[PDB]
Amino acid sequence: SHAPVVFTLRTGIAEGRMVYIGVGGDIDRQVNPKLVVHEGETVQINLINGEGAQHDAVIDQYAARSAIVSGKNASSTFSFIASKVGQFDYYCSLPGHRQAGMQGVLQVVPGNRAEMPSTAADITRDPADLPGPIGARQAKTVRIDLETVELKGQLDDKTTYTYWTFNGKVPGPFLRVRVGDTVELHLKNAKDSLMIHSVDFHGATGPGGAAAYTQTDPGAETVVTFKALVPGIFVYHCATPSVPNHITNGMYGLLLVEPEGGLPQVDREFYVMQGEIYTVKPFGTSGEQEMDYEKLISEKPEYFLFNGSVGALTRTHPLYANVGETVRIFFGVGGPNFTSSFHVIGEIFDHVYALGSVTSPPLTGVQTVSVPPGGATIVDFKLDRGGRYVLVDHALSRLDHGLVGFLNVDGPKNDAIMHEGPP
Amino acid sequence: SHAPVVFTLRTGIAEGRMVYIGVGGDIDRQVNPKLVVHEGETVQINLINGEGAQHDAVIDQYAARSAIVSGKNASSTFSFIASKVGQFDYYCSLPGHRQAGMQGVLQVVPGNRAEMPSTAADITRDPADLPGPIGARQAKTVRIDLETVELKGQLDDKTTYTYWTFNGKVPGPFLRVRVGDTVELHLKNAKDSLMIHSVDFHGATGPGGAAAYTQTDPGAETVVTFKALVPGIFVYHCATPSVPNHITNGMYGLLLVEPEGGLPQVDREFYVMQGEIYTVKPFGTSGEQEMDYEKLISEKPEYFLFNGSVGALTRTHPLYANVGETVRIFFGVGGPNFTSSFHVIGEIFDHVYALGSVTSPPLTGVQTVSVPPGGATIVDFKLDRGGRYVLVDHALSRLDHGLVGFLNVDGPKNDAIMHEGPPK
Amino acid sequence: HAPVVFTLRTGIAEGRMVYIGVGGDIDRQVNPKLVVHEGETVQINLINGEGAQHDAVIDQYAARSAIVSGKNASSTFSFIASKVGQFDYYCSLPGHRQAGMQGVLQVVPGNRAEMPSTAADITRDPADLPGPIGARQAKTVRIDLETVELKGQLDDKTTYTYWTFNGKVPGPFLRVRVGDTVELHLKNAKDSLMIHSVDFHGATGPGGAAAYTQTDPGAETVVTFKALVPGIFVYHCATPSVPNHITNGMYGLLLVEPEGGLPQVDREFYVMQGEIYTVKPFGTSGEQEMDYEKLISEKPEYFLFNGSVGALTRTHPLYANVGETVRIFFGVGGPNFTSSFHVIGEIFDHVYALGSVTSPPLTGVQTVSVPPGGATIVDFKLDRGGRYVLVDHALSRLDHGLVGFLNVDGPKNDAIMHEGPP
Ligand SMILES: [Cu+2]
Ligand SMILES: [Cu+2]
Ligand SMILES: [Cu+2]
Ligand SMILES: [Cu+2]
Ligand SMILES: [Cu+2]
Ligand SMILES: [Cu+2]
Ligand SMILES: [Cu+2]
Ligand SMILES: [Cu+2]
Ligand SMILES: [Cu+2]
């Protein structure tokens, strides 16, 4: 799996013994915690040396072990497939350390892990929730209605956060117009909002990209009209101070201004945006997470997310496509701070629209593309064959902060394009 | 200015009461500080939970409030326009917290905020301070004179720093030659310099980009000649160790090697460079700031700056242009460490010279371009209509570290391109 | 001229106001002797420890720091150790020298000897790659990779446990033609603790081959895949934690040549940038160990070309001749940081943007952003001689081991660059 079940153990002294102590998740501060895993899950165990003796973790029946960690903070991670149901000791093999207390149980339970019933609204934008290509048609007046909504959202399994959104989801609505169109934008700020909200479209020309006309009090409405003068794939975002705050909380989306031709014909389109959340408590902490101002202004986030939540594009709203289809992903970074090294594991980009230019010729045969915050791009590729294709920021530590998505495509394991064994 | 006046409050216990405590700026460590703002200013208040009780901040007459912050370090920022002159209580609405001492005054004063008289040299390069297009002319020998000067500069309103510069400004002089030119470079290191200084031009071919010939002792002079073989927009920087130190302190600039044709004709040109400063004390601290080596080598800066100073391109040397003009910005990142997501709020780049290639066809209709440290680019756009256009690194937390500039363009508020209300 | 660096923190020790050494051969020593060889460039970083006013001065070099006042206030200075002998570094602030702020710089004749190595050399020579494939038809190509866990020389008195393809970092340079059918054998060495795998960015299907190559120690997996698209592709291990497998050294480049081949060039080089996340700071001697909290927080200690400090300066530098066109295949294993790749004293004639081998290259480029899991191609003509220096232009990474040399014999002064006026 590309979504391993992760457990962090720190060695130390508790309850009169030399033990493993759980870090984060369902095992925080528990001594020799039981690691509950479901049959067939991939298990990642991070061992961190707490007190400075020599330590490993060993599981005999999986021939799985860490390396020996010697100094304080010295770490070793290992993984395995929980293929066998039952109870298995994890223990330290260093002389006497197991006798001294360094031992817990891995419990592998049959059947699939249930989802933890959510407590807050699902704020994840489905990646299939966008308008399709506009017909060929004349330029015209297009009315767009945006509502700024502050609301608690399900950030992770067992963890919530107060999102600020366009229309109660992250990212906001995918806006699709034709170059030459006149956009009549209505911004309604919900009555229950504490904050003023606004919108800056990177595809609008004039003060604040519409921000200077859309500073909207709670329960109020602003209306701005602007001409879509330039074709492109544009991030829009709130532009009420603190703008970084409004952005991290989830107030970003994409505006496609289609060129006169339309974009190249493609079978299937997807809407994906990357952003960061800056919480007081580390990634994996249960309960209501809260915003950490010092982390926000210093660019030290805890969550890296596709479409608003951990599991957004894996559990709650994954991407589905069919072999033979050409796929387009509209990909933008709300941010507010980090440049994505956007990549799809198992695929190569046939076309990449450089710096989100829809008028310059796209680059061809590209593995990975840098997308800045307040930037967007378009990638397309042909699904020649089946598999689970995985969306990542290839700054891959961000896997361990919630940043991973699935493109699910039914087809055989083995064909002429990729198979096990030789010809 | 729409530039927000910012105040940070930490909740805690002081003077035997549960209070707000000021963080940084003119309010550092003051309990229930008076927040002085001028009529019509935009006010940003950052509330940070200090001790771990439930808190907000409320201002009744502005219907302005934070969210409730519960745990230690839990934060909520809110803003509003200081539209009414007078005195207004900010207070915590949690049961009993106001009675317990959580209350201060917002003072909204008539008239415009005065600027603090500066203490140190203005080290900000005006963005209009560059040579215009070279005529059509033959390749020739061009003598360039650079002087490396160490000097105290006005980093912010009430805060100074010891800059290292080419010719007493940040960025250094804009150097403009034609491909094929022979450059006769004289580097004079001022008598009063403590450090050796040098120059590496990204547009020069050979040892250290000229650095191996320009290691200049204080009071001394080096002369190097080099041929401008390749057209491009090149960052030059000091290359005396620690190079990152020489760069953060302000020793970076742009060399344009014009292609034979010249660059496309445009109405107005601008010179902008982004860099970082790594200070012991946080952004917003008054007095003489000093360099923090552990922050520099760990890439944890306090200041993100256009042309050397906070307010460089907003207060002291903003950009001015007229509706209808095509504008070119020569934009480079001295760094030394951070990639800029360069963007102008309210405009789209008609042309972007990707990776500073002046010979490859530019990209078209681009919102935002990544520029690496030791990289530069060219963007142009037509000012279709009026406004204050805002230069940013779209890693927008860097707003809160001094990184913002203004392009001022007078014209009506409402025209056919953007206006309030629906279409007519 | 890769500077010898010494860090001094001011403080109180042995009943005196002193300099205290930080890292290297001088960690925690009071008024440490700074041993330097004739003609070396010396960088001294002064950091204020206790909060009095301080500088460091060396009279016979007219070299000094600035005065540093507050706690953590810093000043670095450098000079060329041109004169052999012993020279006092001291604080010039009133009475501070008398109070104990004084040590000796010792400048010794002759070149610094190399530290005898303790662990295997894990640095890939940048010249160790297959040359251009002839013009030829698509065919079946068998590639053999072995995943080897082994102790390597991270720095000249510092070791680390590397995970590698074939015992070097980066892994083998794989070179095929578009249309080729790749028969990949992955052998995981018997002595490995971890499962290993490979994801090629140039393969189409589950995990870029990772889903077929999860290989137990002492075992072998075989996957076949068609190189459908030309490009310069990073490959890496894709066994969890993938970031862990990557930082430890499991990354390399696959060139899928376009039908034409790449433009003719005199000399080719293989360079990859990555990070290592150690418990102890950069410059610490002995067995370094991995710091998980630093890895997931993206706070590395080592920024490296081809696996080691001195990889492309001391142990395996780049060599070329004036007049030659040079191509560098440059990729970022990472796992986390985007390189601002630049060669000091050169300009890129061609840059293959985002590693596109089919789209026209950009021309006359100083510096190119390469993301982690990204690669590019740059070429340039060596018009003249010199030591050309490969850097990430996020230049604080110099102070974490990230620097390489391209050595090219030729005169100091020619018509392209020289000392006097013309
Ligand atoms: Cu143990
Ligand atoms: Cu908002
Ligand atoms: Cu924006
Ligand atoms: Cu309170
Ligand atoms: Cu300098
Ligand atoms: Cu440089
Ligand atoms: Cu002293
Ligand atoms: Cu591996
Ligand atoms: Cu990859």
Numbering used by the authors:
A (entry chain A): 26 to 448
B (entry chain C): 26 to 449
C (entry chain B): 27 to 448
Q: What did the study's authors say about this model?
A:
The two active-site residues, AspCAT and HisCAT around the T2Cu, are involved in substrate binding and catalysis with both residues starting in the deprotonated state prior to substrate-binding events.
In both of these HdNiRs, the T1CuN in the N-terminal tethered cupredoxin domain is placed at a distance of ∼24 Å from the catalytic core T1Cu, which may be considered too far away for an effective electron transfer. A close examination of the structural differences between the two HdNiRs was made with particular emphasis on the non-conserved amino-acid residues between the two enzymes.
